[PDB]
Write a protein that binds this DNA or RNA. Structure first.
Length: 221
RNA sequence: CGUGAACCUUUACUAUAGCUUGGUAUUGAGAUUUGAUUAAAUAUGUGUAGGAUAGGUGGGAGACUUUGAAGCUAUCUCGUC
């Protein structure tokens, strides 16, 4: 009923901008609970091309994430000073192997990767193993913690050239949602492979928790 | 003997008349059908264990609810029945 009404109130042939689409979604928002609005981008993706990056959203609208630190020497103390939700050691590795999963993400130092290697069979189930590609493993443990606090998220491209990121929540302001979407679009464009000629992104739409997806006018300036 | 002729031969080289096949112009109206592609409608997707038909992605814990709920029955498309 509510979904039918929202679908009726959404126009598929209309090309509304980001703010207009956010306003329409908020008006058609029949989900009583605060809903995180996602963005689906169906762009030109190459067969052998991999699309993956990480971007810190301009506003932190996601719930707190348990940031764990795995480092030796002064690395654990530095993470604790930066505000690590959990600071661990080989004892932390043993706790994880026992089932220590009260945190949302795990970051490790280059040395702590020696113990984190045993975390492949444990962390690899959820994909939380430390890595340098996503900034989880690096010399800036404080930088990774700050990005996680700001709401850094990893974007990936599907096998059909599609991606589905989170731009915030319905309760978040229209300006905040627009800023997050613009930052994500700019990051995607900058990651757009130069080996492809034309439009890197074909279409972009925004869908709420239950609201029908609305495709915005894809204009790059 | 001459980087000379002529005619003749052929699975020597390169062309060509003739013959042949397709497109197009002369050259129109119809109908049926096999397609392909364009989108849109719409369904469909069962390793294993597992509550069971778990295709994938992410948002994702509330949503739907006389605009006919649970869910009874008949029946249809798929069925790995």
């Amino acid at each position: 009923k509510k979904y039918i009404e929202a679908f009726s109130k959404v126009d598929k042939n209309k090309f509304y901008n980001i703010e207009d689409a956010i306003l329409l979604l908020k008006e058609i928002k029949f989900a009583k609970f605060d809903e995180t609005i996602d963005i689906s981008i169906n762009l030109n993706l190459k067969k052998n091309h991999t699309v993956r990056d990480t971007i810190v959203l301009p506003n932190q609208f996601m719930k707190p994430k348990r940031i764990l630190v795995f480092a030796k020497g002064d690395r654990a103390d530095e993470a604790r000073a930066f505000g690590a939700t959990y600071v661990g050691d080989d004892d932390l590795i043993n706790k994880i192997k026992s089932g220590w999963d009260e945190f949302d993400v795990v970051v490790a130092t280059p040395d702590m990767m020696k113990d984190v290697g045993r975390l492949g069979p444990i962390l690899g189930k959820r994909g939380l193993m430390p890595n340098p590609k996503t900034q989880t493993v690096t010399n800036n443990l404080k930088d990774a913690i700050n990005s996680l606090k700001k709401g850094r998220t990893e974007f990936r491209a599907n096998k059909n050239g599609v991606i589905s990121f989170s731009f915030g929540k319905s309760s978040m302001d229209n300006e905040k949602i627009k800023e997050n979407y613009e930052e994500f679009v700019k990051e995607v464009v900058k990651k757009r492979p130069s080996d492809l000629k034309g439009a890197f992104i074909d279409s972009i739409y925004i869908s709420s928790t239950m609201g029908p997806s609305i495709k915005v006018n894809f204009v790059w300036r």
